[PDB]
């Protein structure tokens, strides 16, 4: 089918942006203590 | 003309008053107004078809 | 009259399929989902504070103890669902989190209905069902019932626009 | 150079009268004593070359012959098409009401 | 139709299948539309056309007497559809036959019963193995099971 | 111990991580197998001819649908309530085009949710607990029960239950609308009340406890580390949210009692969702919504039109073009 | 087909049999507190 | 590219699950 | 219709800002008894 | 279950950090006319 | 002494034709001074096979075995027609009325589903000069009409159709139309097709004669929005003779 | 607008003759067209048959003209196809046929005339809603 | 100029993959002692 070019582009900064943002504050937080 | 409201819109043509007197029919096995039985033509005026 | 709102929303709309919606959807019943199984899950781990089979004069507003276990239904959701609750401060926040964001949500989906800024249609499906006449999907098929919805009911619900649609081109199967 | 063969024909006689090649056996409710009885000796009997030709279907009473006589004037005839034909559809084309 | 001068038996629906009369998926000539869905129905004012193969169509050609075109008329016009308020037809009809089936009284009323006598069932046997057990009030603080088990992780 | 008690202690043991139980000894495969077969056919199941008219409905994300269009579509009219296994059907592709999969995932996922609700009466026998939690799951299980099951009985084909996909919810939807007038019914009405004031009731019972918790925490950390797991006390002040209720309507419009409060709570949306739940069961015999068409005229005949006569226009738009080509004669009777 | 369908047949019967002889094998005694 | 798109976000998903239930962070009583 | 939520909640956040962390650890069923204090809140009128 | 004596922590420290980012943002800037094309 | 409608429902013989025995191989004389009719003819479908249409097509194309995927709802039953005897000596067989058509959807390798229009409507099959008496030699042939596969309500998934529906792609309403003038109108098919019918065994005293046939006939072409495919279809067959 | 006296006159014959009906045999004639006939009947048009429906200009060009209260006091005693040339009262409601269809056994001679011209006065009243079906409902 | 789809999706990925990597790494060794 003919989808939008950046759909693909934009679907995959849709997830790795906001989680490694996530996953950047959880790795600190278990380094704490 | 089309509302903004519609997607989709049919084709009805009325005359000066608004009586219906021509469309494109969905159904024909009864259709009154089609553009053959009622001989419908177009003619344009200025811009590329003008005449 | 707030069912007429309801079906001319999916005629013209197609309100169904706006994505924000579908987060409002899941806020209230979601919302829903959650003021039952709380309920629930209080009522059948209460500790025995009274001897009268009905247990709802077992509790004084002074008390300073809990009701409830919280120990007990928490394991019992966690061997049931897999994950469950650990702290009632956070489930009582998720409480009001999650019926209130669906709500929000659904506010900002009308408010581009307001423009027609709908989510009525997918592109890449319409281009292809036009040139294949046997691609048929669950979508198209309820566009063709708003076609219906806007044609026959358009010039009673819009009298201002005497709208005259004559028999043979209101959009109908076959022998209905 | 492709064309709706049923819009084509509606340019035809067919839209302004009764096609007795084509037309549903529904039309013949329009006037007086050709339902259901003359309708539907008509159409078994198609297709006709030309109008008067309907006159000629065996056993036909001499008074039966003179009420089509009177319908003559709301009758024509244009080549079978097979859309319209098959199918029975002169018989029960899917409209109702 | 056939009355007006229609086979039957060759008419070709719009989807292909026929118009009048098809097949069962094992073979049975049935009825078309989507009462195909009801070909497993047997009714007295319908059997006497019925053969070793289905619907007989000789059978329908000639032997159809009047009692069963006024039976299938009748039944088709007392269709068990109907509003609560009781206007018979479909919801789209206006008003003017005030009729309902018995059949749909009886059916709805009966499984509104029976929906609320299973939730009976789930209530009154959860309390009463509770009950036998001791623990149909709550949870005994002296002695809560969970707190004597090993913790799942 | 011998063999066959040691295996009944290890089903009903209270030390899984996940409790099996007898129940579950049900559940698992059945839950299993149609969500095994679901994914699979999601994904890449040929069209199916779901009104058996042989027009086929593409239904898989590899046949051109996406998360929003995709469901594996119902069998075929011509099945309409017969059992049609994977050994009845000639092969595979006979089975794949008269709509095999959706039997095979409804009636595994149906016996494995019922085996759900009561395996947390047994589970709750097995901790101590009080049995009605299950009592509240019933009221979704019997929603899923009259849209995979009851209604297809009553209309006589499986063709007319609930596809299992988001646009072919939608379908569902708008036909059981326009052949039921479900809105007018007092059944449905009565389950937007329950979802509806259930949303409220969540939303207000959330906001009461949030605002009325005792201080354990600065404003540097989070407010819920103020209560930790197993705490003997309560960790909001009861009095202080009655009070403050009590005095935005009145006093008596309140509870004081958290017992009957949590009742309450349970009470509204279940009882709501028992009856939408027989609304749709109910409306598969055929015993429609309120009908005021044309219900009011006037002193010389012409029909005065109300706001339910717009609705009928609504539902003939819908009715008309339903199903577009399955039907040869006037009425539709199923 | 057919081997197909014993196999489902098989299949199906063992776990309802341990479905019946579970509950049969004392569960009312499966339980936190009196256990008769 | 967008069956794959779609098949991988919800596999992510089922993956989460196994982590978030097996993988939990204890509950413990004080 | 975003920046609405914005000033309600900033907006509560400075009038309560002494029970942003919760309500008084030591308060009594006697502030918020009814019929009691004249005024609601006012210990000045028992 | 007892802990794992075999654990140890990781490290990388600012000027890593740097060298690393210069690494794969020099390495992209080449690479990428490449994979355009 | 034979089967009733309970003995049959659901065994799938509603769709087999009727068989004659072994030793069902005499002959059924034909008397020119008299005039038969067939009362009833069966035909069963029991092989389906698909020309594919080739690539580089200097190798002839080739037919393909498929299967079924519609189930026991294949077969032609209760078709009568005249049966008239020419100046030659031959019989020639006139179809009028009966079941004479099941749409059949036939899926080949790779998952490609082909429908088509089973049938053998307006058949007039004829025998070659002179036959005597029907023997187990005597064969027919005949053609027959095909007409579309569906008829002229039948609508699109986007409403579009022949007698009835949209004319345009309304989902594109500013699109050019002439990419897909073949999409937007329909067009009703009419072809035509070929059968034999070859008679293995006669039984000379009730008139019934049985063999195997062999048709050809086109696919579906979905009103003329693709080429249809070749269709060849083989199964068995039953007739039966009386006096008119 | 009001049921004015001069929307209950109809034709008596084919003469030209008129009768004035009353409100109360207006208001009987529906209340019994509901009893007996409005279950194929309903607002003009036949369930049992949508080619033929109760407009007033579809029963002025029957076999024999059925626009008036004769003719359809006669169609409900003997009825006939829209060519008369069948006498179809074995399968519709007539009082020639009272032993098959019930209804009909306590219908008196003014009660087919209260009938009659209900189903003559209400094309007056709502015109093409009467025997126009779902399209104007 | 017709240049490659996934090319654009190839450079993000290939810049944003290992870049997050590192990144997890330091702040977490920074959030230690
Ligand atoms: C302990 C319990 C153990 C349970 C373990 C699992 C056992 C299987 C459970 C069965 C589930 C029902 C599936 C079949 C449904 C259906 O097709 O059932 C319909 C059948 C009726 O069958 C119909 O029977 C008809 C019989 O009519 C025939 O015979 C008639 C005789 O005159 C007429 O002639 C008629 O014309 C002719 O066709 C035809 O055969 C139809 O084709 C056939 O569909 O009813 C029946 O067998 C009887 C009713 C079955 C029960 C209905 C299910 C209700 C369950 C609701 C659950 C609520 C849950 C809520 C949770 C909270
Ligand atoms: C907590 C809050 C407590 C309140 C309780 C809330 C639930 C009860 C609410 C009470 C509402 C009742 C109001 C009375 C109006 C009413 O009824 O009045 C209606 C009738 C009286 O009205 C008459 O009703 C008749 C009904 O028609 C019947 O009669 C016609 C000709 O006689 C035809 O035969 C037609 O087919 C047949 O249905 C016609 O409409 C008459 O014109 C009209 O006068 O009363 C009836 O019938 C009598 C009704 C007896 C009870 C019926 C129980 C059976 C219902 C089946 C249950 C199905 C499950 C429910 C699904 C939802
Ligand atoms: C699964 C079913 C389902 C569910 C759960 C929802 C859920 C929702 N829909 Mg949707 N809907 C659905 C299917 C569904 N929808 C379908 C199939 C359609 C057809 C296309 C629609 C069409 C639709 C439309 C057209 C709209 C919704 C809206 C909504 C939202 C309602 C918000 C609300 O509470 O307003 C209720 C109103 C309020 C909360 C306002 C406050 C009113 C005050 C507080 C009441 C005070 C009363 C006072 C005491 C006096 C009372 C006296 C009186 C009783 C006498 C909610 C998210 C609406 C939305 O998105 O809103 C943004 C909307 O406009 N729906
Ligand atoms: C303008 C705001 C407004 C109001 C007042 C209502 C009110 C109502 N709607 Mg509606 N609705 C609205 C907007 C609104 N709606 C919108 C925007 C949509 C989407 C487009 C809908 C869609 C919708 C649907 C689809 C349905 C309703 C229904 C209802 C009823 C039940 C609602 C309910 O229990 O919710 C839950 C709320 C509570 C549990 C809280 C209690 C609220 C009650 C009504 C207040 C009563 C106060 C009382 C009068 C004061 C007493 C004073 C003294 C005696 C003590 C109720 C009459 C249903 C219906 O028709 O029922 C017959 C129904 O099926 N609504
Ligand atoms: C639901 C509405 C709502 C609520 C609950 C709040 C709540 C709050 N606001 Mg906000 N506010 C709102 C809407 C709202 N606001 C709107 C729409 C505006 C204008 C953009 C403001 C502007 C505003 C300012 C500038 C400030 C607040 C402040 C406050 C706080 C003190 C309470 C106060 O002064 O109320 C405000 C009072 C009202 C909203 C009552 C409005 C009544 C009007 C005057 C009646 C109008 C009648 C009109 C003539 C009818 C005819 C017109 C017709 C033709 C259309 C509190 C957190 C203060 C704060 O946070 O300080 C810490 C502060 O400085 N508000
Ligand atoms: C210009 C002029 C003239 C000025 C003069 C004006 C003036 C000065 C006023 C004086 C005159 C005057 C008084 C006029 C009266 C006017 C008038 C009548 C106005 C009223 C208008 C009106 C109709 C308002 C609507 C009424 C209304 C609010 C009804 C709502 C009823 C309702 C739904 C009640 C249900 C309550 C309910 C069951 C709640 C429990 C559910 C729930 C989840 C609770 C959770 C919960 C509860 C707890 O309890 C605690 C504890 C906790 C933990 C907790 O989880
Ligand atoms: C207690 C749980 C344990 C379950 C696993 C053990 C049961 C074995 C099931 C597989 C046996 C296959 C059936 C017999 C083969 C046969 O009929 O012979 C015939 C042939 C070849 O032999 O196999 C076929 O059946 C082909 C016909 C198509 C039907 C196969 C589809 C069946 C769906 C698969 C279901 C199982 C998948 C998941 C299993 C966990
Ligand atoms: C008796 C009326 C039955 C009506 C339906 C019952 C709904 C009640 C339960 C809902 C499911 C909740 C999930 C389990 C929640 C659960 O755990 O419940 C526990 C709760 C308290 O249990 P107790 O142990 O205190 O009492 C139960 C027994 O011990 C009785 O002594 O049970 C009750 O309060 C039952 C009261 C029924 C008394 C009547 C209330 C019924 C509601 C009002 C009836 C009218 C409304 C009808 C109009 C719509
Ligand atoms: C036989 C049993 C079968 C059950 C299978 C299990 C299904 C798994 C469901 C949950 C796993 C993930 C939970 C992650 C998150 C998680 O682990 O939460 C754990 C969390 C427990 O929180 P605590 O109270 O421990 O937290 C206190 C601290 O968080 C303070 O900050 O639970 C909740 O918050 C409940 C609300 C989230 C409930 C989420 C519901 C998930 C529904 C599914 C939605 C997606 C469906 C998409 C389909 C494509
Ligand atoms: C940091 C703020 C973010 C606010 C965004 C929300 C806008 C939505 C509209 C307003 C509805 C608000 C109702 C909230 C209800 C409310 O009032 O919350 C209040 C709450 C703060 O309350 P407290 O500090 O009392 O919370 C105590 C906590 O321990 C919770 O128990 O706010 C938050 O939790 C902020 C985080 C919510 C953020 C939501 C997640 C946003 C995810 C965005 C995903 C982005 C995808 C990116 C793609 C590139
Ligand atoms: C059920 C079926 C009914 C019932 C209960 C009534 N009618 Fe009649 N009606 C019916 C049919 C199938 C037909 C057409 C059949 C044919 O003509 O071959 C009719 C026709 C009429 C007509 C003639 C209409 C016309 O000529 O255009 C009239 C005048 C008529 N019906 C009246 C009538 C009355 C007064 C009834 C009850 C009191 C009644 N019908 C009942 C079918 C059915
Ligand atoms: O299938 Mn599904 O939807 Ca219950 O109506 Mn009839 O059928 Mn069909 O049309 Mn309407
Ligand atoms: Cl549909
Ligand atoms: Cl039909
Ligand atoms: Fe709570």
């Known amino acids: 089918m003919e989808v939008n070019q950046l759909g693909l582009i934009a679907t995959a900064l849709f997830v790795l942006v906001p989680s490694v943002f996530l996953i950047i504050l959880y790795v600190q937080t278990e380094s704490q203590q | 003309r089309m509302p903004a409201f519609f997607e989709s819109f049919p084709v009805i043509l009325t005359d000066k008053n608004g009586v219906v007197k021509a469309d494109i029919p969905f159904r024909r096995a009864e259709s009154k107004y089609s553009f053959e039985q009622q001989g419908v033509t177009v003619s344009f005026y200025g811009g590329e078809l003008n005449g | 009259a707030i069912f007429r709102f309801l079906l001319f929303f999916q005629g013209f709309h197609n309100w169904t399929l706006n994505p924000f919606h579908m987060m409002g959807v899941a806020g209230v ?11 629930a899950t209080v009522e059948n781990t209460l500790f025995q504070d009274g001897e009268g089979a009905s247990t709802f004069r077992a509790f004084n507003p002074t008390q300073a103890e809990e009701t409830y276990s919280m120990v007990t239904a928490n394991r019992f959701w966690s061997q049931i669902f897999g994950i469950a609750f650990s702290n009632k401060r956070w489930l009582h926040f998720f409480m009001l989190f999650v019926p209130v964001t669906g709500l929000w949500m659904s506010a900002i989906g009308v ?56 028999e043979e081109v209101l959009p109908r199967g076959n022998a209905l | 150079e492709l064309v709706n063969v049923v819009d084509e024909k509606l340019g035809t006689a067919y839209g302004e009268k009764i096609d007795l090649n084509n037309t549903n056996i529904a039309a013949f409710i329009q006037y007086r004593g050709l339902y259901p009885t003359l309708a539907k000796l008509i159409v078994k009997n198609a297709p006709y070359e030309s109008v008067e030709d309907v006159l000629n279907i065996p056993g036909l009473t001499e008074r039966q012959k003179q009420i089509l006589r009177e319908n003559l004037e709301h009758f024509t005839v244009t080549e079978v098409e097979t859309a319209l034909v098959e199918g029975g559809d002169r018989y029960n084309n899917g409209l109702y009401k | 139709d056939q009355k007006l001068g229609a086979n039957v038996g060759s008419a070709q629906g719009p989807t292909g299948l026929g118009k009048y009369l098809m097949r069962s998926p094992t073979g049975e000539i049935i009825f078309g539309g989507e009462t195909m869905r009801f070909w497993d129905f047997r009714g007295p004012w319908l059997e006497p056309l019925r053969g ?85 009030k709550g949870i005994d603080r002296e002695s809560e099971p969970v707190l004597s088990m090993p913790s799942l992780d | 111990a ?56 593409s239904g898989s994300l590899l046949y051109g649908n996406n998360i929003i269009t995709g469901a594996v579509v119902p069998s075929s009219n011509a099945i309409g309530l017969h059992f049609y296994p994977i050994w009845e059907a000639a092969s595979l592709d006979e089975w794949l085009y008269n709509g095999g999969p959706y039997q095979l995932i409804i009636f595994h996922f149906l016996l494995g949710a019922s085996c759900y609700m009561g395996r947390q009466w047994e589970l709750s026998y097995r901790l101590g607990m009080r049995p009605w939690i299950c009592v509240a799951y019933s009221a979704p299980l019997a929603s899923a029960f009259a ?188 | 087909m057919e081997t197909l369908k014993i196999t489902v047949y098989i299949v199906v019967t063992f776990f309802v049999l341990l479905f019946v002889f579970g509950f049969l094998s004392g569960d009312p005694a499966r339980n936190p507190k009196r256990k008769d | 590219m967008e069956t794959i798109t779609y098949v991988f976000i919800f596999a992510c998903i089922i993956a989460l699950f196994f982590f978030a239930i097996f993988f939990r962070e204890p509950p413990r009583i004080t | 219709l975003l920046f609405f939520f914005g000033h309600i909640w900033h907006g509560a956040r400075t009038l309560f800002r002494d029970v942003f962390s919760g309500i008084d650890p030591e308060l009594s069923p006697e502030q918020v008894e009814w019929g009691f204090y004249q005024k609601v809140g006012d210990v000045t009128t028992r | 279950m007892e802990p794992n004596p075999n654990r140890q922590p990781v490290e990388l420290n600012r000027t890593s950090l740097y060298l690393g980012l210069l690494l794969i943002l020099v390495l992209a800037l080449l690479f990428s006319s490449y994979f355009f094309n | 002494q034979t089967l009733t409608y309970d003995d049959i429902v659901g065994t799938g013989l509603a769709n087999k034709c009727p068989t004659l025995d072994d030793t069902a191989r005499g002959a059924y004389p034909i008397d020119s001074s008299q005039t038969y009719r067939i009362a009833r003819l069966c035909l069963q479908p029991t092989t389906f096979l698909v020309k594919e249409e080739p690539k580089n097509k200097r190798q002839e194309a080739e037919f393909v075995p498929t299967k079924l995927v519609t189930r026991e709802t294949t077969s ?159 199964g068995v067959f039953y007739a039966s003779i009386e006096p008119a | ?129 009467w025997g126009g079906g779902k399209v104007y409902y």
């Open chain 3, 29 to 39: 019943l979601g919302g829903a989902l959650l003021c039952a199984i709380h309920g």
């Open chain 6, 147 to 334: 849209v995979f099951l009851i209604y297809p009985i009553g209309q006589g084909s499986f063709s007319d239950g609930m596809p299992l996909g988001i646009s072919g919810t939608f379908n569902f939807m708008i036909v059981f609308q326009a052949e039921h007038n479900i809105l007018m019914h007092p059944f449905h009405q009565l389950g937007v009340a329950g979802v509806f004031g259930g949303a409220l009731f969540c939303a207000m019972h959330g906001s009461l406890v949030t605002s009325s918790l005792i201080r354990e925490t600065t404003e540097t950390e989070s407010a819920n580390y103020g209560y930790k797991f197993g705490q003997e006390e309560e960790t909001y002040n009861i009095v202080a949210a009655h009070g403050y209720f009590g005095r935005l309507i009145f006093q008596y419009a309140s509870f004081n009692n958290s017992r009957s409060l949590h009742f309450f709570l349970a009470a509204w949306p279940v009882v709501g969702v028992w009856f939408t739940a027989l609304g749709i069961s109910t409306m598969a015999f055929n015993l429609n919504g309120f009908n005021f068409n044309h219900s009011v005229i006037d002193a010389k005949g012409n029909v005065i039109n109300t706001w339910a006569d717009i609705i009928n226009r609504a539902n003939l738009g819908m009715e008309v073009m339903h199903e577009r080509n399955a039907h040869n004669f006037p009425l539709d009777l199923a």
């Open chain 6, 2 to 57: 011998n063999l066959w008690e040691r295996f009944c202690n290890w089903v009903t043991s209270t030390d899984n991580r996940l409790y099996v139980g007898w129940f579950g000894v049900i559940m698992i495969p059945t839950l299993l197998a149609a969500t095994i077969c679901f994914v699979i056919a999601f994904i890449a199941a040929p069209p199916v001819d779901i009104d058996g008219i042989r027009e086929p409905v």
């Open chain 11, 76 to 234: 032609l039953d209760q078709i009568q027609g005249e049966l008239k005897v020419n100046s030659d000596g031959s019989l020639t067989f006139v179809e009028e009325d009966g079941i004479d058509f099941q749409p059949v959807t036939v899926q080949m390798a790779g998952g490609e589903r082909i429908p088509l229009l089973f049938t053998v409507k307006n058949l007039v099959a004829s025998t070659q000069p002179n036959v005597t008496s029907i023997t187990t030699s005597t064969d027919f042939k005949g053609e027959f009409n095909v007409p579309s596969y569906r008829t002229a309500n039948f609508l699109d998934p986007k409403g579009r159709g022949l007698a009835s529906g949209y004319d345009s792609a309304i989902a594109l309403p500013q699109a050019k139309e002439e990419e897909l003038a073949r999409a937007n109108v329909k067009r009703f098919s009419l072809t035509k097709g070929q059968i034999s019918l070859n008679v293995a065994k006669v039984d000379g005293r009730t008139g019934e004669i049985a063999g195997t046939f062999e048709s050809e006939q086109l696919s579906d072409d979905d009103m003329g929005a693709h080429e249809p495919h070749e269709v060849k279809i083989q």
């Open chain 12, 1 to 129: 607008a009001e049921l004015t006296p001069e929307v209950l006159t109809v034709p008596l014959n084919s003469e030209g003759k008129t009768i004035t009906l009353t409100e109360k045999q207006y208001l009987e004639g529906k209340r019994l067209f509901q009893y007996a006939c409005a279950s194929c009947h309903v607002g003009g048009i036949t369930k049992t048959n949508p080619s033929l429906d109760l407009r007033t200009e579809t029963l002025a060009l029957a076999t024999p003209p059925r626009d008036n209260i004769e003719g359809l006091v006669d169609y409900m005693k003997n009825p006939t196809t829209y060519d008369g040339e069948q006498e179809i009262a074995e399968v519709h409601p007539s009082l020639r046929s009272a032993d098959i269809f019930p209804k009909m056994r306590n219908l008196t001679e003014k009660d087919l005339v209260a009938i009659a011209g209900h189903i003559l006065v209400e094309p007056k009243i709502l015109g093409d809603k």
């Open chain 3, 111 to 166: 408010v581009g209905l307001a423009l027609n800024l709908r989510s009525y249609d997918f592109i890449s499906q319409e281009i292809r069902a036009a040139e294949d006449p046997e691609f048929e999907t669950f979508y198209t098929k309820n566009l063709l019932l708003n076609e219906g919805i806007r044609a026959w009911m358009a010039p009673q619900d819009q009298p201002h626009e005497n709208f005259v649609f004559p």
């Open chain 5, 52 to 136: 070793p193969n289905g619907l007989d169509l000789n059978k329908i050609k000639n032997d159809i007497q009047p009692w069963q075109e006024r039976r299938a008329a009748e039944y088709m016009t007392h269709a068990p559809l109907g509003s609560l308020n009781s206007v018979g037809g479909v919801a789209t009809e206006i008003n003017s036959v005030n009729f309902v089936s018995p059949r749909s009284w009886l059916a709805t009323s009966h499984f509104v019963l029976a929906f609320f006598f299973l939730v009976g069932h789930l209530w009154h046997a959860g309390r009463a193995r509770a009950a036998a057990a001791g623990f149909e």
